[PDB]
Structure formats: C-alpha cells, structure tokens
Design a protein around this ligand. Sequence first.
Ligand SMILES: CCCCCC(=O)OC[C@H](CCP(=O)([O-])OCC[N+](C)(C)C)OC(=O)CCCCC
Ligand SMILES: [Zn+2]
Ligand SMILES: [Zn+2]
Ligand SMILES: [Zn+2]
Length: 245
Amino acid sequence: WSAEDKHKEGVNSHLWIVNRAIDIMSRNTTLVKQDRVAQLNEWRTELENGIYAANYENPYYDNSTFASHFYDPDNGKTYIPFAKQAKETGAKYFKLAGESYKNKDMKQAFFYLGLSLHYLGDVNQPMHAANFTNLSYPQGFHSKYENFVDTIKDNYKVTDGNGYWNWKGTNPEEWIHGAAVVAKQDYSGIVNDNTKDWFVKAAVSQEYADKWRAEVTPMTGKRLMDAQRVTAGYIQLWFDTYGDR
Ligand SMILES: CCCCCC(=O)OC[C@H](CCP(=O)([O-])OCC[N+](C)(C)C)OC(=O)CCCCC
Ligand SMILES: [Zn+2]
Ligand SMILES: [Zn+2]
Ligand SMILES: [Zn+2]
C-alpha cells in the first residue's frame, strides 16, 4: 500500500489502515484497555515515522528493491531469491519494539512497532502476497493500483469494534503468514487477463481506465476491511505480550 506522506492519510494507505485499526480498538468497550489507545496517540509521531520509513530508507526498503515488503505464503519467499521477506522482517520489528517497550524506551518502541505494522499491512495487499511487483507485467500496474486505492479507501472503513482478537497464536509470524494466505486467495480478483488488458488500453482510453478501477474495487474494499481488523488484533497482541503480565 501507499505511504507517500508521513502524516497525511490522504496519500498514505498504510497510515490509514493503522488509524482505522486504532478506531476499532477505541470502539471496543468489552475487551480493549483504552489507555493502550492513549499510548499509541501519545507516541503517534514515532509510530508514523516507523510506518513511513519502511518505504524510504535502508535497511527497511532493501536498497530500493523492497524485497522485505513481499511474502508468498506458499513458498515462504519474496520476489528476489535469498532476500529477506515480510514475515521474518515484520516479526523482527514486533519483537524489537517489545523489548524497547519493556525497557521504557517509548520512542524506540513505537517507531519499531510502526515498522512492524507496515510489513503486516503489506501482506494484506494481494500483489505483495503473490510477488507481483511494479516490474511484473503489466509494468506499472502495482503502483497505479495502490495510488488508486487512496482515492476510494474511505468508503471501506470498518465502523464496529470487532477486530480479529487472538486471530492467530502469540507468534507474530503466524499473523503475518495468516494475513498473506487470505490476501493471496483474493489475488485473481485484482490481477487477471481483464484488468491487465484494460490497464494497458487505459494508456490511450480513459474509458478503459475507469473499467479496471471499477473491476478491482469490490475486492479492494474487502481487503481493506480485513486489513483493518487484523491490524487491530495485531496491536492488541503486542500490548498483551509486552504490556505487563
Ligand atoms: C521509479 C519508480 C519507483 C516506483 C516503485 C514502486 O511503485 O514500488 C512498490 C513496491 C513497494 C512496497 P509498498 O509499501 O507497497 O510501496 C508503495 C509506495 N512507494 C514505492 C512510493 C514507496 O515495490 C515493488 O514493486 C518493487 C519493484 C520496484 C520497481 C522500481
Ligand atoms: Zn505498502
Ligand atoms: Zn506495493
Ligand atoms: Zn511496503
């Protein structure tokens, strides 16, 4: 997903997903301790820095190849042989964030959590769970799709307090893998002969530009809503794990 601006949801789908997940936690009045939401907002600057940094600097963006932002649940690999993938990388920052938290280094803890949330967010994007990059055919489709998502995401906000609490085990890797499994299933709903064909013809015909956008919207809405619920459960897990007990 996009992450063009560090603090603006308008062009940062990653930030939007996290903010909506926090809203889910805020709406939940039977399980979530609201002081957890207070802490996230207190260290929002560091959190947002982490969400953003993943796409703009080393080692997070792997020398501009973003290899660590991809993870195919079927073979457990990213799109470049032997490179690090989203599951191990996302889990790495989830744990680093927790250790910092336990040591009262809030700035470090929330920056790392932000990074971890970025990776979790990415595997919810079908293309990232299928190793379909901006260089995959049709070239350029990956980025144009994520840019389009920013224009319609607000129509798919989750408005209840039901996050996927304890969705998977206590191991963050299970959460990232689980999200990728579901996302890859919805891959064909976004990338297929039709959308590929229309995207290419969209170059000369606005008529076709509207066609592929419409075609991928339903599945996009579903993916965005799932991403919100999973992220809320992931954050809740982080606090249950490192928040004393
Ligand atoms: C020269 C143009 C750069 C565009 C690159 C791009 O759109 O990357 C998207 C994801 C990046 C992970 P993401 O979080 O979904 O990033 C989206 C936003 N952004 C690329 C602007 C940082 O990575 C790839 O597809 C790898 C191949 C790169 C080809 C040059
Ligand atoms: Zn992304
Ligand atoms: Zn992407
Ligand atoms: Zn990314």
